[PDB]
């Protein structure tokens, strides 16, 4: 299925994944297609951080959903 | 002598007391707290019952309120962890946690009325006859800034489409990758509307995170029906301008102060963690719009990152009186018995 990503410059990518994607392997999907090392990488769905090793499908995270890249520091 | 008492300062905590402040005078949430039933809840580890303390403090002391318990119940307990997550994110976890104790409760679904809007996330091919609308909630609006010159700018910015073609082409099913665009449609907008503002943004030219001070500007009354989809002459999308949470930093760190207007009257206070005093309007409002960048003092990084708005037909109901009666007399009496 596909998924879309907005990187940190406002770009939107699109993503070819799985449900039983770990978050991890999306990362390495990310890396593969934009360049984007994983450990730059910090996505944000439902207002939330996800973890590296839980699935697209624990996260609910459907076709045509989109996740950001957002900034390793961004709060205070 | 406001009769709004403040919030210790206990660390590097950053947002976190303005938030609690935010939500403290989110009257109808601050209430259905309060019924939550936490008396089975462990205090080391329940989010519930360490809201319910903080509130109950913040509307009975006369002295400033510490928050320990509570960030030991959801296990931020450094200040890498604050530095990490933004506000928002904060918001989130705290309101997705009391919504879930809420469910089967007399105040079950408080958080999605309060703070849940509907969009359409829509797809529309350009050169074949292909659309897919998806419905989406929301519970905060993220605005770029950079660039902007207000609220309305950050909307229209909010609203533009993206352009998926060259190796990014939607998946159309049996039409294959296609050309399309992606955009997002309002079709609600929530009584109480968390607006983030992008203070910091990734320079492409640079691989930094910056800091934007840019003068933004936005309104103590906001009107939004021109960007619903389908608007109700009885109920007008204005919004109500309740609180300014202000950074004065060009990192990540630094000073984090407050402005709200508690009753929605446009008589605004500077809640300094311990220290609450009366403000003028324009220190709440215009002196954090930014745009002091030829300024050598702090003025110069100090603006706003989160706007909170009410929808003035909704401003009653959000802003309904708390009383001692709202609290649980089994609640009043084990928080007691906890101090000492």
Redesign the interface.
């Known amino acids: 299925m596909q998924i879309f990503v907005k990187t940190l410059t406002g770009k939107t990518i699109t993503l070819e994944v799985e449900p039983s994607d770990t978050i991890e392997n999306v990362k390495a999907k990310i890396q593969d297609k934009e360049g984007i090392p994983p450990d730059q990488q910090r996505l944000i769905f439902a207002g939330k951080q996800l973890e590296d090793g839980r699935t697209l499908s624990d996260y609910n995270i459907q076709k045509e959903s989109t996740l950001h890249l957002v900034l390793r520091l961004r709060g205070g | 002598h406001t009769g709004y008492v403040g919030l210790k300062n206990q660390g590097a905590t950053?947002?976190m007391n303005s938030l609690l402040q935010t939500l403290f005078f989110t009257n109808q949430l601050r209430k259905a707290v309060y019924m939550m039933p936490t008396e089975g809840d462990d205090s080391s580890k329940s989010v519930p019952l360490a809201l319910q303390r903080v509130f109950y403090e913040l509307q009975h002391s006369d002295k400033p309120v510490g928050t320990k318990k509570l960030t030991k119940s959801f296990g931020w307990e450094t200040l890498d962890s604050?530095?990490?997550?933004?506000?928002?994110?904060?918001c989130?976890?705290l309101l997705?946690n009391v919504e879930n104790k809420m469910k089967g409760t007399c105040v079950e679904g408080t958080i999605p009325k309060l703070f849940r809007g509907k969009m359409v996330?829509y797809?529309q091919c350009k050169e074949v006859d292909y659309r897919?609308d998806?419905r989406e909630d929301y519970?905060?609006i993220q605005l770029?800034i950079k660039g902007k010159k207000n609220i309305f700018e950050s909307f229209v910015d909010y609203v533009a489409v993206?352009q998926?073609d060259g190796?990014?082409?939607?998946?159309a099913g049996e039409h294959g990758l296609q050309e399309a665009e992606?955009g997002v449609k309002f079709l609600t907008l929530p009584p109480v509307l968390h607006l983030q503002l992008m203070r910091?943004?990734?320079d492409?030219q640079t691989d930094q995170?910056i800091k934007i001070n840019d003068r933004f500007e936005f309104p103590e009354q906001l009107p939004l029906d021109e960007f619903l989809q389908k608007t109700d002459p009885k109920d007008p999308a204005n919004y109500i301008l309740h609180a300014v949470l202000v950074?004065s930093?060009d990192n990540?760190?630094?000073h984090?102060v407050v402005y709200l207007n508690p009753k929605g009257d446009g008589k605004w206070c500077k809640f300094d963690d311990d220290v609450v005093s009366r403000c003028t309007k324009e220190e709440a409002i215009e002196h954090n719009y930014g745009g002091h960048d030829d300024d050598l003092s702090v003025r110069h990084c100090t603006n706003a990152y989160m706007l909170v708005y009410i929808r003035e037909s909704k401003l009653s109901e959000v802003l309904q009186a708390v009383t001692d009666h709202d609290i649980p007399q089994q609640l009043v009496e084990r928080l007691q018995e906890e101090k000492r």
Do not use: A, T
């Not at chain 2, 604050?82 to 904060?90: G, P, R, W």
């Not at chain 2, 190796?167 to 998946?171: G, L, V």
């Open positions: 950053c947002y604050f530095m990490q997550h933004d506000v928002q994110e904060l989130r976890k997705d996330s797809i897919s998806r519970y905060d770029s993206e998926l190796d990014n082409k939607y998946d992606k910091f943004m990734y492409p995170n950074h930093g990540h760190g630094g984090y």
